[PDB]
Amino acid sequence: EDELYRQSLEIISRYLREQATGAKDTKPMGRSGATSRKALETLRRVGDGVQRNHETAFQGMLRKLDIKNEDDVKSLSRVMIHVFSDGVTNWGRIVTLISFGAFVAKHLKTINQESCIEPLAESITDVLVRTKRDWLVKQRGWDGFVEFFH
Ligand SMILES: CCc1sc2ncnc(N[C@H](Cc3ccccc3)C(=O)O)c2c1-c1ccccc1C
């Protein structure tokens, strides 16, 4: 159907869920498994890095967005389009968008709003793939991401 979308959702949804709960998903990765695994290993290193290095900036943004429920998560979409989509495009901003997803997902787990983590992952994947389709394709998608951060 749309392999780039499917693979993107798989990687982003797994990272966000693993960050929120601490459990690594052992259910085998779907089509192009070698790439999705390396992509997720890359996020574990670079994404954990951005969250640790920029905790204060991440925390201040979470505080502005005041996420309390499903409604607040739905309104993050408009913000991500304005903040992410309207800026320059590059793997460093893509990793920042996804890392901030993880930081929000951990927040959702603490406040007993885990049911919002899957929707969040879908919203981030939709923002990324809908708005950066041609750039992702030109940069060889998730193979490119993995090669970029080696
Ligand atoms: C809605 C929140 C989002 S989505 C997003 N996507 C890409 N980059 C972001 N941020 C980087 C700056 C940057 C780099 C590293 C750490 C912190 C902040 C960019 O704008 O270059 C952002 C931000 C965002 C914007 C401002 C403050 C905090 C965040 C999370």
Curated annotation (Swiss-Prot):
Its main location: membrane. Changing residue 38 to R: No effect on ubiquitination. It is found in: Membrane; Cytoplasm; Mitochondrion; Nucleus, Nucleoplasm. A motif (BH3) lies at residues 39-53. GO terms for cellular component: Bcl-2 family protein complex; cytoplasm; cytosol; membrane; mitochondrial outer membrane; mitochondrion; nucleoplasm; nucleus. Induction: Expression increases early during phorbol ester-induced differentiation along the monocyte/macrophage pathway in myeloid leukemia cell line ML-1. Rapidly up-regulated by CSF2 in ML-1 cells. Up-regulated by heat shock-induced differentiation. Expression increases early during retinoic acid-induced differentiation. There is a cross-link at residues 24, 27 (Glycyl lysine isopeptide (Lys-Gly) (interchain with G-Cter in ubiquitin)). Keywords: Apoptosis, Cytoplasm, Developmental protein, Differentiation, Isopeptide bond, Membrane, Mitochondrion, Nucleus, Phosphoprotein, Transmembrane, Transmembrane helix, Ubl conjugation. Changing residue 64 to R: No effect on ubiquitination. One of its GO terms (biological process) is positive regulation of apoptotic process. A motif (BH1) lies at residues 82-102. Cleaved by CASP3 during apoptosis. A motif (BH2) lies at residues 134-149. It comes from the Eukaryota. GO terms for molecular function: BH3 domain binding; channel activity; protein heterodimerization activity; protein transmembrane transporter activity. Involved in the regulation of apoptosis versus cell survival, and in the maintenance of viability but not of proliferation. Mediates its effects by interactions with a number of other regulators of apoptosis. Isoform 1 inhibits apoptosis. Isoform 2 promotes apoptosis. Belongs to the Bcl-2 family. Interacts with HIF3A (via C-terminus domain). Interacts with BAD, BOK, BIK and BMF. Interacts with PMAIP1. Interacts with BBC3. Isoform 1 interacts with BAX, BAK1 and TPT1. Heterodimer of isoform 1 and isoform 2. Homodimers of isoform 1 or isoform 2 are not detected. Isoform 2 does not interact with pro-apoptotic BCL2-related proteins. Interacts with RTL10/BOP. Interacts with BCL2L11; may sequester BCL2L11 to prevent its pro-apoptotic activity. Interacts with GIMAP5 and HSPA8/HSC70; the interaction between HSPA8 and MCL1 is impaired in the absence of GIMAP5. This is Induced myeloid leukemia cell differentiation protein Mcl-1. It comes from Homo sapiens (Human). The lineage of its organism: Eukaryota, Metazoa, Chordata, Craniata, Vertebrata. The gene is MCL1. The chain holds residues 171 to 320 of 350 of the full protein.
